[PDB]
Subunit: 307 residues, 4 copies
């Protein structure tokens, strides 16, 4: 059987080979606790240590499964999608119900994540998220409902495949460049560029925006209204920010659909970057990484058009 | 025919009786430009003037249609749902495509909004949003896609009815108290309590939260991760805030599903309020209004359980 | 504690495998029939409806375990025929009860909570699945395998369940339960109604065979807004003019088949099904045919229930 | 500018009513047939496929105007039979071209942009509607009246259109166009395949009539994961054992009908349709039957296309 490494970032989602013994019949599992934290507290340090671990141990194993909380799983998955250089399957998985709760979802989630990680056909598709019998790509996947076990969905382009009876039918694969095809290399980095997110809505204070500028943040992501629009006070602070060196990326609070370039706002005029289908938290991820390569908004836009 | 008043808050969404003449065959339309602004700039002053106008003119007409931009329509609609005391239909409508663009959606949107406003069966259901042949309640309706004409949907409980050939079949009506059944009365108010929204994600700065506290904001709404969870730095600032008088409401960045009380966080312990199915921008609306009645988080929670 | 009766129609969906039930209700159970839901039939429907109506005053609410294949059919039939205003809640499982992360146990727990909540009464026959309370009319099966498959695709759910509490924010407008004019206590059988499908180059043979067998009604799973392939139209038009009740529904999973849109229904005596999908339409047409054979009266029924 | 040919099969969906087309392509048009899409048939399919394959080297891409009722059927049939790798894009309108806010004009503009974009080639036959580029296999009609009805309910769309530009982020894995073993140039007719529906108490009469008429294949719109009402099962089992190709699909709008799950397919010679809904399954079974009558070979086809 294939040997799959399980990297845990927190508690157990099932309760591992003893908690879900059926696992030892499809893979050879070793487990390492890499960090232990709730995902609402996920952070840069954790991201860096994970990417490095996966990159160092790529040849010690046939695949990876990462147990992680659901709240920020979608951010971690995209970070790794951009930084892992192991074309072998890296599959993330979590659980929406506590492991001791009735009809706990963890056990079967874990099983299906190991199934996915172990299938050769899963290789070379970038980092994946596996939940609710579905194989989801790290870029587009996002949490759609606060409590539903079916919460994870790729709301713009769809899943990569479905899992029935330990088998996967892949009918899709992502087009946006990832893993070995990106120029990102966090292997020597101990920190990441500071990027914050500000929200837009009626009568929005500019204060949040101004705090980030005061603190010399490297980038700021705007969760805009509609097609990335900005409340005027926020538009003014961000315009300013962009002229004094803070990268500014326009995304949207609207859960699906792209924030398009030169549509609602003149990005070229202000030196802003439109995030495409990257929601705010995902846009933060690429902006941070783009900032380790360049600070030219034109080049940041190009990065946003390709990753 | 019934006489319907169209209150415009910005430009035309069609191009009114001359731009969509079919209108004069279903209603008697008068139009007033109440303000002229892009909805990304929507604000308290506009909300107050609209509520008052609708309340003053309730007996001058059989119904209201409000033309408004799409970016914050969902916020205005809920504000009015809470403050209008005219049980007559108040129907909001906007357009996702410019009026001069091919297959402009405005014309037929406007027509269907007038159809809705004119149907007696539409009365007593609170403030409505009409878009894409659908009648949506002001509380649950939200913008789901950045550009799609079908963007407005009530993502937790569904629409109230569908519109085919100028006819409506209502199969639902909202249960949460609105209009005349709320204690909110902005008729004498010239300002609203200050409420801001802060976003949570991996490695979230507490700075935004702290700016609002520094400025003596009355309330703060957290767009949390998952079931309203908070990044630790943000959790600490907000906990503090709540002890020194800032109302704190936990909502979620996740587009559907409720942020439940005493689930992921101990709201009772910290004096926080869980927003139920109110997304961040909608939660801001009720929190602002709840703040004109009380500052006791227990009572704010009760308000969040009933409106 | 509330008395709740679990009426089972098949195999179990849990396994007490859910001891936590003692915390919310006094539970007793009866195996009413035992079949795979894909073989659900008129006899089961009649007996179920009669059992609930007969037993209404012995318990505080009912939970009905049922396979997922035709849960949406039974739920609507019960929605139209139950004369008990106490909560009737149907429940199933998408995963075998012995499979890992089986959904049955929590689904069942949630159904008893729903059946026992006093706020659940007077909302008609309910279906509880994946933490959601769904009305029997609009509820349909949306995905072949996903635990979250049950959704009310047109009008949404009535309420969500978290930690054993329901936040109801909706109730259906279409009349059901004791508000309908249907009465199963007098029926040992139901009018014959079949369903035919429409698609490119569709044979009229299925429709023809139904008519030849003297079927009381036929529901057309049409294309788009209830349209019909030419040959199927031709056949059903004659049928409707000669006494067969004919209802236009649609193969399209959401949205209504409207009146006076695509087809001139009055001209032929056809009835438009509204938001009722073909299998749901069938439930209502069978029932309407126990009350009348008149197309206009049947359309009225379809506009009301 | 690119040469794009618009092949019309019905009434127009715009009305130049869209002069803005001159900005993106040199357009010429031919009325290939003229019918309501609810009467779409084998003859139209054959002629369309032949026309595109014959005319492939005269233009840069094709746009096909087609009614919405069976757009998803034609699109898949073309997906399986077009041997031209240039973009073929189907397009419709959900509102009358003269109604207010008609969708046809912008839909058409978007289809020509798609047909003319060089990045659109080699993705198979496409359907463009509501600013979205959708593959012909997974695309289905989701709502009876909404302009946004066309969606790829299982795997999503290939790309979105904004301001005349497409951000393609997906392409289908299932082989299509010249990769299939089908060849319509040799066909004046297609094998007879009908579709029967399953639901509670389903009559076996439709299935029986199809078999009696010597149908080459039958697709079952089953319940849940492709299951069958007892009587329909019994009939199709005999049919499959005696030479009728039988494909299990599902009435359920999303998700696959899987192999070796609910039914022992090999035991009877049934074929599981995968994510192919009944009308789509029919398209592929008709085509498979022009190549073989062997169930295992047909299942292989269903696992590949
Ligand atoms: Zn990727
Ligand atoms: Zn309301
Ligand atoms: Zn009902
Ligand atoms: Zn009643
Ligand atoms: Zn294809
Ligand atoms: Zn090829």
């Amino acid at each position: 059987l294939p040997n799959i490494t399980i990297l845990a970032t927190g508690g157990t989602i099932a309760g591992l080979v003893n908690a879900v013994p059926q696992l030892k019949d499809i893979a050879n599992v070793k487990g390492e606790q890499v960090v232990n934290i709730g995902s609402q507290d996920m952070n840069d340090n954790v991201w860096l240590t994970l990417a490095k671990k996966i990159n160092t141990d790529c040849d010690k194993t046939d695949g990876f499964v990462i147990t992680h909380g659901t709240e920020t799983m979608e951010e971690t998955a995209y970070f790794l999608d951009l930084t892992v250089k192991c074309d072998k399957p890296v599959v993330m998985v979590g659980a929406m119900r506590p492991s001791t709760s009735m009809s706990a979802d963890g056990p079967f989630n874990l099983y299906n994540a190991v199934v996915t990680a172990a299938d050769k056909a899963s290789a070379n598709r970038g980092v994946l998220v596996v939940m609710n019998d579905t194989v989801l790509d790290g870029r587009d996947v996002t949490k759609t409902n606060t409590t539903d076990v079916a919460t994870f969905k790729s709301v713009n382009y769809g899943p990569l495949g479905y899992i029935h009876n330990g088998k996967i039918d892949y009918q899709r694969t992502p087009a946006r460049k990832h893993t070995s095809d990106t120029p990102f290399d966090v292997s020597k980095l101990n920190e990441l560029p500071k990027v914050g997110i500000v929200y837009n809505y009626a009568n929005a204070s500019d204060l949040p925006a101004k705090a980030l500028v005061d603190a010399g943040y490297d980038g700021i992501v705007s969760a805009g209204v509609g097609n990335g629009n900005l409340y005027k006070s926020v538009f003014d602070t961000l315009a300013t920010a962009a002229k004094t060196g803070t990268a500014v990326v326009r995304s949207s609070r609207v859960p699906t659909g792209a924030t398009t370039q030169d549509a609602e706002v003149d990005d070229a005029k202000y030196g802003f970057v439109a995030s495409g289908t990257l929601n705010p938290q995902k846009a933060r991820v690429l902006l941070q990484l783009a900032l380790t390569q360049t600070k030219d908004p034109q080049q940041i836009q190009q990065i946003f058009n390709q990753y």
